[PDB]
Structure formats: structure tokens, C-alpha cells
Amino acid sequence: DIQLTQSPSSLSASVGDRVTMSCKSSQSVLYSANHKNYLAWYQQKPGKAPKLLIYWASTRESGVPSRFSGSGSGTDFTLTISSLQPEDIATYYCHQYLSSWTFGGGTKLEIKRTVAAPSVFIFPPSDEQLKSGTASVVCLLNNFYPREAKVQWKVDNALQSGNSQESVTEQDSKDSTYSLSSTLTLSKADYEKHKVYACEVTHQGLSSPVTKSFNRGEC
Amino acid sequence: VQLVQSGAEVKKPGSSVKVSCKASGYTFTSYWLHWVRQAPGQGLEWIGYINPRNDYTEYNQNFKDKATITADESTNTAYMELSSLRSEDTAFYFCARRDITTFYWGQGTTVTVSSASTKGPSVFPLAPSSKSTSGGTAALGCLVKDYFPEPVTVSWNSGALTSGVHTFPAVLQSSGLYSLSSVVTVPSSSLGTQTYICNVNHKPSNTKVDKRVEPKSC
DSSP states (O other), rough: OOOOOOOSSSEEEETTTOEEEEEEESSOOOOOTTTOBOOEEEOOOOOOOOEEETTTTTTEESOOOOOEEEEETTTEEEEESOOOGGGEEEEOOOOOSSSSSSSSEEEEEEEOOOOOEEEEEEEEEHHHHHHHHHEEEEEEEEEEEESSSEEEEEEETEESSSSSEEEEEOOTTTOOOOOOOOEEEHHHHHHHOEEEEEEEEEEETTTSOEEEEEEETTT | OEEEOOOOEEEOOOEEEEEEEEESSOOOGOOOEEEEOTTTOOOOEEEOOOOTTTTTEEEEEEGTTEEEEEETTTTTTTEEEESSSGGGEEEEEEEEEESSOEEEEEEOOEEOOOSOOBOOOOEEEEEGGGEOOOOTTTEEEEEEEBSSSOOOOOEGGGGGGGGGEEEEEOOOOOTTTTEEEEEEEEEEBBTTOOOOOEEEEEEETTTTEEHHHHHHOO
């Protein structure tokens, strides 16, 4: 029914910045009986329930830091964070409760920092896994910013597809970097069929792609 | 004055699940109780609500053939039941109520729908070497592979080592089994002159493994 549009979908800002995000409703959420705007703002950390920041568009929750404030009336609302702090890395949601509940799409907020190239590490499969009949090669990208990075696996210079999987940590609260871990998995017989195992890493902090590589049998 | 939801659920496709939301510290029939879904990496989606005073219910159109919300004033407990579970039902489920002064959300309940069955992981070393060294920094870790369901917990040196330890989010493999890596950033000088042990626990399979990670010379 009443749709909510949040913008931007993502925000990057330095600690201490003033930050604003907007929420616009398809219809007015200002109720005629009490002249109250049925709009709330939430902060949500991963794996956790959303935490209420603002209710009735402008009333701040009791325990919430005074750096958070809400403004607007009718169909256009704004959440402002006066001085961005490192603990504010989260996804922010607007929520209208005038009619049946609807939510904005969220604003993912991250800390902006100096570009940092990843340290690239590679781990050959262990003797224990090989005894079991499989070989996993792990490529590690440590403490880089920004989050966008490309990891390509190459076996004897052949690009690999459909045999690897990666995961990225949440942004670190101390140095505002990300880390990424990628596992390439082959059967032991297929692993023993090739010599060079390499992960090629592309990142804004790298003037050229970096390759971490090893030869089967060398470790 | 809090809403307490039942624990994590792992279900096979085709089964049903009923999650509970206990309300305490207020009058249970005085406020509508809502349910909200959040699929992994996605936003918040309203499921429906119940008026516990007269058992009146309304649902999001998208959940009409999936969710049934009930309540019991006599036990001050609300329920949300999901029928004929499928993989797309894997999500976070919250109960939430609105007061005059504030909102109260439950802590959330994960529902994981998978055909896979319980399995303990193998813990393989991620051996440090020149291939995992840069300057005065070396990386080592443990690969915790092929387990179900979540979660696994990893400590290093029985909890005595926390600096430079980061555990990555698990990845769901095509087999339907999770895999996770836990790594540690250490001074390169400590390789060979410091013992590193990863302690892996998977309680669903009663798996407990302590793996020494020893350096390789390459």
C-alpha cells in the first residue's frame, strides 16, 4: 500500500561527518486526528533486531545518542547523524505504521577511509585434506578498502569457474577495512593433474593485479 | 517489557514450523502483535498481525498461503506458523509490537530450510609460509569444512589469543554443507617460535577439535 523509498541505498562517510538519509512515502503518513506522523527510523546491526532511533518522525528514543535526529512531515522525512561515529556502521530503515506496516529498502552506512590495498596470502591444501581425497586452496585478502575486490583463480593459467566460493567480513570497527577469504576446491585427482595454482587479485589500491601462486609439491 | 522468541530452527523442505513470541511486562491483549520477515542480505518485510483481544488477523498479500498467526491470552504468547517450508523460507523472523511510547521487537528467530542432515566438520590447517607472509606480517588459520547446520565456534590457544583473529562468514556449498575459515594475523617472527592452536566446536554434531597449525617451509 503505502510504499517507502529510502535513499541512498549506501552511504560512505568519514568519522565526524554529518550524514543524512531520506525516506519518502507514496502517501501521507500524517494522521488527521492527532497531527502525528506515523514514521519511525531504525538502526540494525548484522544478525540483530532493528533498534528504534526515532518515533513519530522527530521524537528521539530515550537511550539514543543526541547525534541522531529525525525531521520532516507528511511524505518527506530525513534521519540525520550529526557527527558520524565508528559504531554507526549499520543498515538504517524507515518504517511507516499509519496503515499496514511497510519499510524502506534500507541505507547501508560504512566508514570512508584512505584506500588500502589488500595483503594477499595463499594457502596450499593440507596433508590431512589430501589424505581424505579433496584439495582446497585458500586465498586471503587482508585489511583492504574499499570493499570492492576481484579474486580470480587460475590453474595452469586457466581461469576457474564454478569451483570457488568467497565470503567477506563486516567492516572492522578499528581500522574500517574489510577482509575476504576465497576457497577453490578440486578433487585430489584433478589437483594432481596441474602444477600452478594462483589467485589473481584486482583492487583500487593495486596499480596492477597481484598474483599469489604456488606449485603443487613445493610446500 | 520484552518480547522473547523461540530458538533457532532447522527444517527439511515440506515440513512446518511454529515460532513463538512471549510477551511479558504489559497487557498482552491491549496491543497488536506483528510478525516481520528478513531474508538473508535483504530488507524488512511485514508478514501480518493479530489483535490478541479478538484473534482478528490480517496478512501481507505475499504471505497468505504461507503464514498463520495465532495468539493465546491465557499464556500471553503469540505464534507464527509456516506451512510447507521451502528454501526461500530461510530467513530471520521477528515479532514486534507498538506502544504509545515506543516499539518492542523480539530478538529474532532464524529458520533454515535445507535437505541436508547434521554433520560435523573437518578442521584442516591453513599452514603459514612465505606464500602467506608480507613484510613483518604472516597469516595462518584453520579451514572448517563440510558441516551442518550452523554454527561453529572457533577460539585460538584455548581463548588466550584474540589479537589478529578474524573468523569469516561461512559459505553454503552446492552440497548444502557449510564451510568456514578462521585466520590469525601474527608477527612473521613468531612463526616457528610460537604455538598456534585453533579450537573448533560444532555442538549439533558434538564435534570438538583442537588443531595445531604448524608452519611450512616454502
